[PDB]
Tab-separated table of C-alpha atoms and ligand atoms in Angstrom:
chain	number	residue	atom	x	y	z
A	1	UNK	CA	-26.980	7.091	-33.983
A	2	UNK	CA	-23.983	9.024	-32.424
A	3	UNK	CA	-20.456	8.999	-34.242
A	4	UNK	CA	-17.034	10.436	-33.340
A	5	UNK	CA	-14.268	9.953	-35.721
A	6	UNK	CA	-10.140	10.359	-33.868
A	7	UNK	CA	-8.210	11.080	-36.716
A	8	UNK	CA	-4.557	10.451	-35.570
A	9	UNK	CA	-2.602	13.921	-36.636
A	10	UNK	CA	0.220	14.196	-34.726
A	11	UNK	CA	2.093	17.403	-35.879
A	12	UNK	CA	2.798	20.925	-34.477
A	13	UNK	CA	1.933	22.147	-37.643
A	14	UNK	CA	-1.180	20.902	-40.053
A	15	UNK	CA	-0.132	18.773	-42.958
A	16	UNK	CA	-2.429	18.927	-46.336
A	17	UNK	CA	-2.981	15.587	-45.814
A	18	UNK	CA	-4.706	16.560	-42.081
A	19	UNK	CA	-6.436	19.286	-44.216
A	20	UNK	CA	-7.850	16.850	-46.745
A	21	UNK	CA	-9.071	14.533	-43.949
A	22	UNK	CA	-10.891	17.433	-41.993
A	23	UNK	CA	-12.699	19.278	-45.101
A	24	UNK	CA	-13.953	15.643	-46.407
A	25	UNK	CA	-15.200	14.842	-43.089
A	26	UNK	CA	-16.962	18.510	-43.030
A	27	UNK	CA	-18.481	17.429	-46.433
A	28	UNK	CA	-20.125	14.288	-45.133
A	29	UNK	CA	-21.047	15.761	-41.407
A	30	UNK	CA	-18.714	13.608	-39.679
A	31	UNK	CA	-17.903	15.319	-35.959
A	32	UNK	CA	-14.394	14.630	-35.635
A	33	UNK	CA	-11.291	15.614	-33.630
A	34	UNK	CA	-7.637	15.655	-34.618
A	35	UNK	CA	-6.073	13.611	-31.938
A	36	UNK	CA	-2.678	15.190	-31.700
A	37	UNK	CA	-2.926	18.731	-33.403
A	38	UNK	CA	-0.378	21.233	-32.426
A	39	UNK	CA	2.324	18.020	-30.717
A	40	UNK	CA	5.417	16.860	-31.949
A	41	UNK	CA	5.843	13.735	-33.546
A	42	UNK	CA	8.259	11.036	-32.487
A	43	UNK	CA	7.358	7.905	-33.454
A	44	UNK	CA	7.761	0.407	-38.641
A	45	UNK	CA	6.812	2.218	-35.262
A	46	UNK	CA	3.341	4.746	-34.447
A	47	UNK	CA	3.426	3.516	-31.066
A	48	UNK	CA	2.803	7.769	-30.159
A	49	UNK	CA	-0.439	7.414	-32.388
A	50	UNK	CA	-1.498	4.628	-29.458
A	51	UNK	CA	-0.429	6.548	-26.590
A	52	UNK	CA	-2.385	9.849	-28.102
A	53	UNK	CA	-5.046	8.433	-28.644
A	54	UNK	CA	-5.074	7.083	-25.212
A	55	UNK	CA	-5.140	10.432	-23.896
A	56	UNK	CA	-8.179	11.499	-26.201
A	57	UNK	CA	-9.664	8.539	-24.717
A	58	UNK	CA	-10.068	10.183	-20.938
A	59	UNK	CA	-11.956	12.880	-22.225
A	60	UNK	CA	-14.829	10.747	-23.671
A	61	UNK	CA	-16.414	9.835	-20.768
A	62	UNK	CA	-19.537	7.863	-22.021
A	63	UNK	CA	-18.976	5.210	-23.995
A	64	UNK	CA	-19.280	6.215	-27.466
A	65	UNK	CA	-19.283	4.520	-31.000
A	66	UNK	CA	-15.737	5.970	-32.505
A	67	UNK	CA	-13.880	5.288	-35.534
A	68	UNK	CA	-10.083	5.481	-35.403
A	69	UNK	CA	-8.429	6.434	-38.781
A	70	UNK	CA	-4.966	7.923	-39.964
A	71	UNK	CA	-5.132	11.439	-41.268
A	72	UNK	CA	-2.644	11.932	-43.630
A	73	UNK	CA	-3.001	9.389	-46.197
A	74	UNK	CA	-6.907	9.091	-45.622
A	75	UNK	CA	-10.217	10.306	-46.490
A	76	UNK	CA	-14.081	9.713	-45.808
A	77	UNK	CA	-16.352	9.248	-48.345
A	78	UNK	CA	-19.500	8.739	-46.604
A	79	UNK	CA	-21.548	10.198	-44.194
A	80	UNK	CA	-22.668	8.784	-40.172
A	81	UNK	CA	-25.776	6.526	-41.592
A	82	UNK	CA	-24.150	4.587	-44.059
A	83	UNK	CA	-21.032	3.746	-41.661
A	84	UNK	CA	-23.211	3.187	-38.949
A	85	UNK	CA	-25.409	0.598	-41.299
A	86	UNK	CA	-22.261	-1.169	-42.094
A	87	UNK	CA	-20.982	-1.286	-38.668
A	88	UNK	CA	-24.119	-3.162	-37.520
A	89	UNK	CA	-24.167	-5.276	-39.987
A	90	UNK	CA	-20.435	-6.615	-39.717
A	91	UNK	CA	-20.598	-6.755	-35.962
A	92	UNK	CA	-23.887	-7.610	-34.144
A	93	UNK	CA	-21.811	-8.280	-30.965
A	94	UNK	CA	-20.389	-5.040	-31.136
A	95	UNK	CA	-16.898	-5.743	-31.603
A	96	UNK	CA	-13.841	-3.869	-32.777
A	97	UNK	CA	-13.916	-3.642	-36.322
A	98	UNK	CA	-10.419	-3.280	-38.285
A	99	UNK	CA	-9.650	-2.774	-41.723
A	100	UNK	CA	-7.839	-5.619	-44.081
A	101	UNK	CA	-5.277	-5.127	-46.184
A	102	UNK	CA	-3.343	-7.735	-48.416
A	103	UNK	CA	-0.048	-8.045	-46.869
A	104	UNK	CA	1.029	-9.515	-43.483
A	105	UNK	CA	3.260	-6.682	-41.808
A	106	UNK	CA	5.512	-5.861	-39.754
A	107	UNK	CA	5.933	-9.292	-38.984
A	108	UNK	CA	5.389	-11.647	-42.281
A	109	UNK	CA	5.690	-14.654	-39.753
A	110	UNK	CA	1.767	-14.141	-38.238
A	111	UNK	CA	0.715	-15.863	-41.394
A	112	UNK	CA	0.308	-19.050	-40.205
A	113	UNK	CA	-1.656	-17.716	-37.257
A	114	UNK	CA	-4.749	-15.394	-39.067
A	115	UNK	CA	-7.330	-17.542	-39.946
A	116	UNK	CA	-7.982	-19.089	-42.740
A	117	UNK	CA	-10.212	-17.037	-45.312
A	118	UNK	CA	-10.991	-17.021	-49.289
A	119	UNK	CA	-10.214	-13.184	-49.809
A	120	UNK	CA	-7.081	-12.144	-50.439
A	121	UNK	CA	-7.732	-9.612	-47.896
A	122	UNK	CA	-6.480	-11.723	-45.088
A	123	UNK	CA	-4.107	-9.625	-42.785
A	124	UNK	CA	-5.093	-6.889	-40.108
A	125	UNK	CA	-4.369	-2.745	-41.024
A	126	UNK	CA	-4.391	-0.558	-38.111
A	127	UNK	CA	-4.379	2.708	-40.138
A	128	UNK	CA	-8.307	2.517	-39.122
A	129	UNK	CA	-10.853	0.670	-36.884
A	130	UNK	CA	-14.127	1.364	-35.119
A	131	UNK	CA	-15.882	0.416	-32.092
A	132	UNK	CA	-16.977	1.299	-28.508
A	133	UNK	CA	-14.741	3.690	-26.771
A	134	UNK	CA	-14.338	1.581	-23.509
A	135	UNK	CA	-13.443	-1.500	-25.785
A	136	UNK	CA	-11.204	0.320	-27.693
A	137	UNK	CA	-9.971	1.900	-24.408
A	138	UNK	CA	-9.205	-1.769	-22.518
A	139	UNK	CA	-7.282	-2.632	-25.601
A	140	UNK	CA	-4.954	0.310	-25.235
A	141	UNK	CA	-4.852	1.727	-21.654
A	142	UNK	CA	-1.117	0.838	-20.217
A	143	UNK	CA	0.723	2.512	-23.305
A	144	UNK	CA	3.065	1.333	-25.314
A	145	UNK	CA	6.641	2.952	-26.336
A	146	UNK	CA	6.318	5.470	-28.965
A	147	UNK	CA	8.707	3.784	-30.885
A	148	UNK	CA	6.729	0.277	-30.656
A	149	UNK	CA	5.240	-0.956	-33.625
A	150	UNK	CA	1.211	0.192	-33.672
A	151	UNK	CA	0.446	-2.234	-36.439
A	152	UNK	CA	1.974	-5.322	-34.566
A	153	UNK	CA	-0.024	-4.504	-31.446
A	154	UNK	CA	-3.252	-4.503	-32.985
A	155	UNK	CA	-2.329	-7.651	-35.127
A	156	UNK	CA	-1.659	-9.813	-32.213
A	157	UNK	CA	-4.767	-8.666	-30.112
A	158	UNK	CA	-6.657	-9.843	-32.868
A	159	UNK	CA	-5.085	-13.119	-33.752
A	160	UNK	CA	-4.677	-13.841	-29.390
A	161	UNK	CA	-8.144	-12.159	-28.705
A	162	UNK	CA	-11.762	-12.443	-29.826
A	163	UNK	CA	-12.322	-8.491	-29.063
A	164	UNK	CA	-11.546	-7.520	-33.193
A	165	UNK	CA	-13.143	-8.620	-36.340
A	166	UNK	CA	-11.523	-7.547	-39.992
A	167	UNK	CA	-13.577	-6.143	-42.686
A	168	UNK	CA	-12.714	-8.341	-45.299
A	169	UNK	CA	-15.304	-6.938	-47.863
A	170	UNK	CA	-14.065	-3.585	-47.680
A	171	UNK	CA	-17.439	-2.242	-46.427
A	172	UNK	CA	-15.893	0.205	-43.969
A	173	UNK	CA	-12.134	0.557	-45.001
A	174	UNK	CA	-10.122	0.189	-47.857
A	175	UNK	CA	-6.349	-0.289	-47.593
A	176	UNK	CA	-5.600	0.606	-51.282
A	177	UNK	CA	-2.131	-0.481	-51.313
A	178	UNK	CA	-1.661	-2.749	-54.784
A	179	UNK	CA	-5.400	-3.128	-54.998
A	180	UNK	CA	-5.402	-0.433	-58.199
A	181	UNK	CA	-6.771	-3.084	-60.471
A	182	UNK	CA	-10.042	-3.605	-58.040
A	183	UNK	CA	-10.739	0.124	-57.177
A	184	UNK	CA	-12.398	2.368	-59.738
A	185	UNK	CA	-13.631	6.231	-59.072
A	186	UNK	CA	-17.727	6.141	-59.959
A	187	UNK	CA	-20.396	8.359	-58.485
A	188	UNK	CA	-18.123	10.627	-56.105
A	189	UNK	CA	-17.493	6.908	-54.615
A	190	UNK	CA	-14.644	4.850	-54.646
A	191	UNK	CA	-16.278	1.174	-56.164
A	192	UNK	CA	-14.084	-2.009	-55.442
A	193	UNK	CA	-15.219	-4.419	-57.924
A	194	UNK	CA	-13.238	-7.968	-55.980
A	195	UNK	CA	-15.108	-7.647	-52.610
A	196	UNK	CA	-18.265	-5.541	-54.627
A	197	UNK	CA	-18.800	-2.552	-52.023
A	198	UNK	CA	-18.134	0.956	-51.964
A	199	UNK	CA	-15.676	1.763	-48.920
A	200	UNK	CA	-15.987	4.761	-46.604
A	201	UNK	CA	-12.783	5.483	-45.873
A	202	UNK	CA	-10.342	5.908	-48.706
A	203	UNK	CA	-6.933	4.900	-47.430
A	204	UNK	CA	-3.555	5.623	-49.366
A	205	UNK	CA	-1.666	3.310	-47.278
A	206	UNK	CA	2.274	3.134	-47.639
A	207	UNK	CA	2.943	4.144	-51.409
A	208	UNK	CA	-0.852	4.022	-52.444
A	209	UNK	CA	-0.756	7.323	-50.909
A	210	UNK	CA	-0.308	8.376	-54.710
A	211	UNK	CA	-3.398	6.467	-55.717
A	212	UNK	CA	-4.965	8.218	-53.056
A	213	UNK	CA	-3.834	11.427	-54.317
A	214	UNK	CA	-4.519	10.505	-58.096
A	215	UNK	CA	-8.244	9.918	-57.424
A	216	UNK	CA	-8.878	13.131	-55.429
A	217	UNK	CA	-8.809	15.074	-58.797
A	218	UNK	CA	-12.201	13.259	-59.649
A	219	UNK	CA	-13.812	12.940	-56.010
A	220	UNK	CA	-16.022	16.349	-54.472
A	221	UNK	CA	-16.966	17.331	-50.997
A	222	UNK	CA	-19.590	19.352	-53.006
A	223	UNK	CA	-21.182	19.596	-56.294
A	224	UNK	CA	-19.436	21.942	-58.539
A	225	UNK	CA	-20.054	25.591	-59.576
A	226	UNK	CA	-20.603	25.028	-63.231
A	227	UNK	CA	-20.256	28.535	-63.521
A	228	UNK	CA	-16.760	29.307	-62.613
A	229	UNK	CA	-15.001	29.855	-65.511
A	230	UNK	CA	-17.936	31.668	-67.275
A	231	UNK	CA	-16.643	34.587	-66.713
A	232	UNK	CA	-12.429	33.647	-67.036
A	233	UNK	CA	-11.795	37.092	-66.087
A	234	UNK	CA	-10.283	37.269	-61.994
A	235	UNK	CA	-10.003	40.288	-60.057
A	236	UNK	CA	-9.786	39.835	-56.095
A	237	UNK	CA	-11.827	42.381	-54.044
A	238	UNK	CA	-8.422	42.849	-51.808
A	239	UNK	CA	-5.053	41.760	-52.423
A	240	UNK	CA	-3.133	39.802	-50.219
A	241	UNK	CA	0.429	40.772	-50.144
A	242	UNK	CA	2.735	38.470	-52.949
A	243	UNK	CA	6.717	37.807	-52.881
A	244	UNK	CA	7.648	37.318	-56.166
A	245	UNK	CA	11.007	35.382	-56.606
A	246	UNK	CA	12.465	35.510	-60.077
A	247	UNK	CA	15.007	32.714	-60.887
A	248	UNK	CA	16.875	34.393	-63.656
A	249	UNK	CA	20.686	34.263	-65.963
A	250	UNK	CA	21.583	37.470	-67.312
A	251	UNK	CA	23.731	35.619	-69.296
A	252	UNK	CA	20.934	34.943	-71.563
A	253	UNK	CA	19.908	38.843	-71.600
A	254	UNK	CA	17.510	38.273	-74.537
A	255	UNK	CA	15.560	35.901	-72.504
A	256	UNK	CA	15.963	37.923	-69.477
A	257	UNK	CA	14.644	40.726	-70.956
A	258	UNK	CA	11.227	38.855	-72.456
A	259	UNK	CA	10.590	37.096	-69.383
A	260	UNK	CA	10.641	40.209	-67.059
A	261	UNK	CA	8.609	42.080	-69.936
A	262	UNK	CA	5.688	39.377	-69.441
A	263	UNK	CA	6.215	39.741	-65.243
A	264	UNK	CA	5.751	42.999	-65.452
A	265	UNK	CA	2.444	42.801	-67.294
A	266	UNK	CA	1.268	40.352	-64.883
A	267	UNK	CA	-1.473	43.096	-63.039
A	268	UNK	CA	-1.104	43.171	-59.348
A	269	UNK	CA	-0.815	45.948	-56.733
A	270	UNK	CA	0.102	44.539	-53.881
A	271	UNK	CA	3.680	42.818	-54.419
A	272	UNK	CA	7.642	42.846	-53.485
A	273	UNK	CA	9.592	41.380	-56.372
A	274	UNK	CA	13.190	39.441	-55.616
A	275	UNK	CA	15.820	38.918	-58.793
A	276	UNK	CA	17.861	35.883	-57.914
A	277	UNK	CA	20.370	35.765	-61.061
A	278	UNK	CA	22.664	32.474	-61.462
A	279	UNK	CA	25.538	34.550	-63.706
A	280	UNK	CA	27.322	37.416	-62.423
A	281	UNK	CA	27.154	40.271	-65.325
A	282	UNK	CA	28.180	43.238	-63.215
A	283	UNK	CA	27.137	46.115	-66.179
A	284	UNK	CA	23.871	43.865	-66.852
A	285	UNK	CA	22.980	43.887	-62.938
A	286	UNK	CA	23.478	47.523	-63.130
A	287	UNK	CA	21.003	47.817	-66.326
A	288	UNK	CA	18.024	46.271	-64.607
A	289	UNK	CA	18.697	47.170	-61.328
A	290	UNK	CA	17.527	50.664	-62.204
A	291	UNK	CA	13.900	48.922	-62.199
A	292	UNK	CA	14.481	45.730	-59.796
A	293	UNK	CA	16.683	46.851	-57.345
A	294	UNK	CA	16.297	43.875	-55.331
A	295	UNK	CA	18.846	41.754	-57.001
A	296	UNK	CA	21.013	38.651	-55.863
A	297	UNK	CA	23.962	37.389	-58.018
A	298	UNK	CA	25.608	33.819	-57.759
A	299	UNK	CA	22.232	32.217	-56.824
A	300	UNK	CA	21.517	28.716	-57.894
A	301	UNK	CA	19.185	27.226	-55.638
A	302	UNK	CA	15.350	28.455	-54.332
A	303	UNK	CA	15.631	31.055	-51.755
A	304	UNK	CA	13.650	31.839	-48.993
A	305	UNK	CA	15.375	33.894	-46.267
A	306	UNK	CA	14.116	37.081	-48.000
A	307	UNK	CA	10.575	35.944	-47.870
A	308	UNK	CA	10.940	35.111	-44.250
A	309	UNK	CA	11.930	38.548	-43.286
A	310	UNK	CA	9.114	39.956	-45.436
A	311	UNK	CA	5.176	40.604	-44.438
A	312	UNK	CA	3.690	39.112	-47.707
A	313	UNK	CA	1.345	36.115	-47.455
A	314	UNK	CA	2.369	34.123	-51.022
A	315	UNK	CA	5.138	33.501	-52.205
A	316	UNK	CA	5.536	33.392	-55.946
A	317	UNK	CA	8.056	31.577	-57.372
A	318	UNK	CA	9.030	32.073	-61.510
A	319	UNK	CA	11.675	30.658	-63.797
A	320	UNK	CA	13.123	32.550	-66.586
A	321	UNK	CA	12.159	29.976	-68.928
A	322	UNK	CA	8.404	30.312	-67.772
A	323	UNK	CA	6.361	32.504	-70.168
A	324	UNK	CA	3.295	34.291	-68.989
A	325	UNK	CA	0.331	35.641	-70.780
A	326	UNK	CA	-2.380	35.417	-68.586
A	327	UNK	CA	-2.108	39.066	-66.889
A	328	UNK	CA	-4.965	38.001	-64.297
A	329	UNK	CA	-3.475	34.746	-63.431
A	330	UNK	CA	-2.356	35.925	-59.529
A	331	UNK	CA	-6.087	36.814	-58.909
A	332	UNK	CA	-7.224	33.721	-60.574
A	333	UNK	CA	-4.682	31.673	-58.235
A	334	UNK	CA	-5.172	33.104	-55.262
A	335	UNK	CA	-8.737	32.592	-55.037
A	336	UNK	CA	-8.255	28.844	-55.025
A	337	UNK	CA	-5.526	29.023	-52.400
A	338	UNK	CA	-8.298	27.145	-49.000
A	339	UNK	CA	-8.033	24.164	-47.250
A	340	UNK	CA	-5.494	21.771	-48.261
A	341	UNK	CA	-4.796	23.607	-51.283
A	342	UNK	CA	-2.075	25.708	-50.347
A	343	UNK	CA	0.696	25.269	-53.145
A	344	UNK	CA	-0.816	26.138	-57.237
A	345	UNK	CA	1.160	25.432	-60.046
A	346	UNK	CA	-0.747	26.533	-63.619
A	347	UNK	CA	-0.061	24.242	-66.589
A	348	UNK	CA	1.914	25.728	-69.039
A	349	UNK	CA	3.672	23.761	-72.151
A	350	UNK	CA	6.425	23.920	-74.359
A	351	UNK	CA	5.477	27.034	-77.346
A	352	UNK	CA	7.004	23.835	-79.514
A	353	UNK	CA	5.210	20.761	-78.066
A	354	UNK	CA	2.193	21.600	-75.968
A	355	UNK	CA	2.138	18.421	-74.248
A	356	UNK	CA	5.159	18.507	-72.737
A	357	UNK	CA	4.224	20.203	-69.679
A	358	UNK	CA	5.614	22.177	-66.275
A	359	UNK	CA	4.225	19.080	-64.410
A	360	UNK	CA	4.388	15.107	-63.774
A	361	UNK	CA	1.448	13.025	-63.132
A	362	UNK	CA	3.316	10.098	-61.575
A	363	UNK	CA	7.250	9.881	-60.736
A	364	UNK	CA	9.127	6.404	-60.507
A	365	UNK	CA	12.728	6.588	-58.850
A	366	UNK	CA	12.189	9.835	-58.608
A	367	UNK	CA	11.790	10.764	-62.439
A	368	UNK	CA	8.533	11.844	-65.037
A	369	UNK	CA	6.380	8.905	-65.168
A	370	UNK	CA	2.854	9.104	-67.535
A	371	UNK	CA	0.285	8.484	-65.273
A	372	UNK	CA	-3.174	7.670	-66.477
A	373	UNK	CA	-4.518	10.853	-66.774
A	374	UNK	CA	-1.794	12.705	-68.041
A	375	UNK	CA	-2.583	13.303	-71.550
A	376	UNK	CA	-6.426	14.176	-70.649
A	377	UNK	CA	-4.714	16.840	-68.512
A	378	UNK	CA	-2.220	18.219	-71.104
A	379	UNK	CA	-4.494	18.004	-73.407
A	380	UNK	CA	-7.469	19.595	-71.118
A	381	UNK	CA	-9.986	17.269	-71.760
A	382	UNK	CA	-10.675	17.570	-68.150
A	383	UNK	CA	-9.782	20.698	-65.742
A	384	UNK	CA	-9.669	21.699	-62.318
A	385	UNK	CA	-6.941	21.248	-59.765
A	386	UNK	CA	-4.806	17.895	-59.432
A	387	UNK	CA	-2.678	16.512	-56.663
A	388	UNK	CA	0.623	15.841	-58.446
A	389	UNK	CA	3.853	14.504	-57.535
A	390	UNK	CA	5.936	17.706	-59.174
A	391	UNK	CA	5.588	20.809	-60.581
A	392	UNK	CA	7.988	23.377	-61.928
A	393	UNK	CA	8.356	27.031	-62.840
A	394	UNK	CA	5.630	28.856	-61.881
A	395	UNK	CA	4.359	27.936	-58.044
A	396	UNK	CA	2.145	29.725	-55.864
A	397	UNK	CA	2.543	28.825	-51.989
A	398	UNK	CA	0.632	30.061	-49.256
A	399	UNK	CA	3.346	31.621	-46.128
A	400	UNK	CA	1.741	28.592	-44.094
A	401	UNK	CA	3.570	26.378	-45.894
A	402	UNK	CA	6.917	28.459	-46.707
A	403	UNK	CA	7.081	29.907	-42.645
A	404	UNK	CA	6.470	26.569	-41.367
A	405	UNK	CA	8.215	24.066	-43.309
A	406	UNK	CA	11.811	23.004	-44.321
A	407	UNK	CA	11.952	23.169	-48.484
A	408	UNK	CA	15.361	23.312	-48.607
A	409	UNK	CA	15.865	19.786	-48.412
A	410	UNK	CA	18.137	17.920	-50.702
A	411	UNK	CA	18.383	14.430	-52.497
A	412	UNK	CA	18.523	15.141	-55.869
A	413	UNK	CA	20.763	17.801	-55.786
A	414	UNK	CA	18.487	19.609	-58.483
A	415	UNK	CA	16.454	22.820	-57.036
A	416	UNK	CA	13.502	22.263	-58.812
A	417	UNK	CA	13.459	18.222	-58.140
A	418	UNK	CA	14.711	19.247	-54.435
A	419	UNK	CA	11.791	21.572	-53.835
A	420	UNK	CA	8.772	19.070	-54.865
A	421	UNK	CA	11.153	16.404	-52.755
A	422	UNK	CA	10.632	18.981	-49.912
A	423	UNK	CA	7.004	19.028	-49.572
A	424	UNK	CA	6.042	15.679	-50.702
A	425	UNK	CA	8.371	14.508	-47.439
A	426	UNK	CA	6.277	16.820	-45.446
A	427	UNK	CA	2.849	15.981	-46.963
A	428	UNK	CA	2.447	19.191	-48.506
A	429	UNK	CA	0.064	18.781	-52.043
A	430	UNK	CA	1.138	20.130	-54.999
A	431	UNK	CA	-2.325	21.058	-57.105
A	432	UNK	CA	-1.505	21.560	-61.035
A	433	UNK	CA	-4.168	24.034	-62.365
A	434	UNK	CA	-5.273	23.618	-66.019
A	435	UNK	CA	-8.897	25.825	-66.040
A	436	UNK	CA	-7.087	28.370	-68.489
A	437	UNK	CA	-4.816	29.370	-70.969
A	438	UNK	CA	-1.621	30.927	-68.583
A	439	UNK	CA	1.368	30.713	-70.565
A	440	UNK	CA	4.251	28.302	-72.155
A	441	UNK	CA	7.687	27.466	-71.491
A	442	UNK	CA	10.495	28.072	-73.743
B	501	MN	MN1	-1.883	5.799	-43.436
């Protein structure tokens, strides 16, 4: 009846993914630990998550049920009944039990040596298992090299042992890599209609990560507060310090002018407010200065070294081009800035075409791509907050993230593009807000 759950989060600082993981295992009263917290990561390859978890290992003494999962790319969706039901049930003998996925990796030439099965779910995942701790233990206890292949190991005890048995029905795991058209969000439950079961653990393995991360907009770790927006009026009891970081062109004074108009209306105490201009207009610098004295000329990508020396908590990041009209909207951000949701972009949408908006539902090589949601979103048939590949203009990011994590990283050579590059790399969310009317772009 007891259950320990070793989600593998190697990392001297906590990823949203690692976030995610921990407040969806709160929500279902899973105990867990993060194997790994606070280490550096090293290691095709995770040969470091084997050798971690090793050393969990010697502190679990007695020989305990465990689950083994990833972190980052992973979430529960059940409690310790249902997953110790299933566990019974696949495994009488008490064996390892490993989730399947469709592909044969790292090494495509095992094929001809996993049995023989109808499923397409043939091949061995090692992004999460479950069994006895001294079983599990045995398997692993000499090491391996951090740079050694994790999936590889685990592939070959099974096919050379008897000691694992795959979950081919998807009872326990789901690897949702290219299984989109079997997988469908009902009742706070993932349902996969090929293998008919309802998997516990929700994994976003390789690229499915974005599946993964599409879904959580309609999953809960509780029920909602129907109430919230009520009242649409925010006002936080104390106000946490806020950077703001105004990417501006005097060269376009007119538009200068309205957008720092519409900042200045936006009502909060507590702030220190940065003017990083692209254009050098020495007698227009002069002009504002007089009321933003804080001003940067010749600036053409995000800036954070002024933050960094600051004491402010969030920093708030606005393009010129970005209209506000919500004067509340910092207090209305700020109080859904927990957790894993560290980084709050509102929806906002062109004052000409509404629907083109300040964020992207799916990218593909990089670029916009409609996801499946996208117009529902625009459109606000539904609203809340929603894991998104990009968002632009107006960004609200905890210090966590901006003290802790390179965002300065480049591959599109585009500051905006650059930025969402950043902390996608790093497993940083980006949440898109739509629960109110904030603004447009021009
Ligand atoms: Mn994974």
């Amino acid at each position: 009846d007891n259950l320990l759950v070793l989600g593998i989060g190697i990392s001297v600082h906590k990823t949203d993914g690692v976030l995610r993981f921990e407040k969806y295992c709160q929500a279902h009263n899973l105990q867990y630990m993060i194997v790994g917290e606070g280490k550096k990561w090293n290691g095709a390859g995770g040969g470091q998550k084997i050798n971690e978890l090793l050393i969990a290992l010697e502190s679990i003494k007695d020989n305990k049920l465990i689950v083994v999962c990833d972190t980052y790319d992973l979430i529960p969706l059940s409690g310790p009944e249902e997953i110790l039901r299933k566990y019974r049930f696949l495994t009488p003998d008490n064996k390892v039990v490993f989730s399947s996925e469709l592909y044969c990796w790292p090494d495509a030439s095992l094929v001809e040596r996993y049995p023989k099965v109808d499923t397409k779910y043939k091949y061995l995942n090692s992004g999460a298992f479950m069994g006895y701790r001294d079983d599990i233990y045995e398997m692993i206890k000499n090491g391996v090299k951090d740079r050694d292949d994790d999936q590889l190991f685990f592939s070959i005890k099974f096919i050379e042992t008897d000691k694992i048995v795959l979950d081919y029905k998807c009872e326990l795991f789901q690897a949702m890599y290219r299984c989109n058209s079997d997988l469908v969000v009902h009742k706070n439950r993932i349902f996969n209609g090929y293998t008919n079961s309802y998997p516990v653990f929700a994994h976003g393995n390789g690229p499915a990560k974005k599946l993964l991360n599409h879904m959580e907009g309609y999953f809960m770790t509780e029920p909602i507060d129907g109430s919230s927006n009520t009242i649409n009026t925010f006002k936080l009891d104390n106000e946490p310090k806020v950077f703001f970081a105004l990417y501006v062109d005097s060269n376009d004074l007119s538009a200068l002018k309205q957008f720092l108009g519409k900042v200045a209306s936006i009502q909060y105490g507590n702030k220190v407010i940065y003017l990083y201009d692209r254009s050098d207009n020495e007698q227009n610098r002069k002009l504002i200065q007089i009321s933003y004295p804080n001003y940067h000329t010749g600036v053409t990508k995000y800036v954070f070294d002024d933050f960094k020396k600051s004491d402010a908590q969030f920093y708030f990041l606005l393009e010129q081009n970005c209209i506000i009209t919500k004067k509340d909207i910092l207090h209305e951000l700020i109080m859904q800035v927990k957790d894993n949701h560290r980084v709050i972009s509102p929806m906002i949408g062109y004052e000409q075409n509404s629907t083109r908006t300040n964020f992207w539902g799916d990218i593909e090589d990089g670029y916009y791509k409609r996801s499946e949601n996208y117009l529902d979103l625009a459109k606000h048939k539904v609203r809340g907050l929603w894991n998104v590949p990009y968002v632009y203009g107006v960004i609200l990011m905890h210090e966590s993230v901006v003290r802790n994590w390179d965002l300065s990283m480049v591959k599109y050579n585009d500051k905006d593009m650059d930025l969402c590059f950043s902390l996608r790399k790093h497993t940083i969310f980006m949440y898109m807000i739509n629960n109110n009317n904030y603004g447009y772009m021009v």
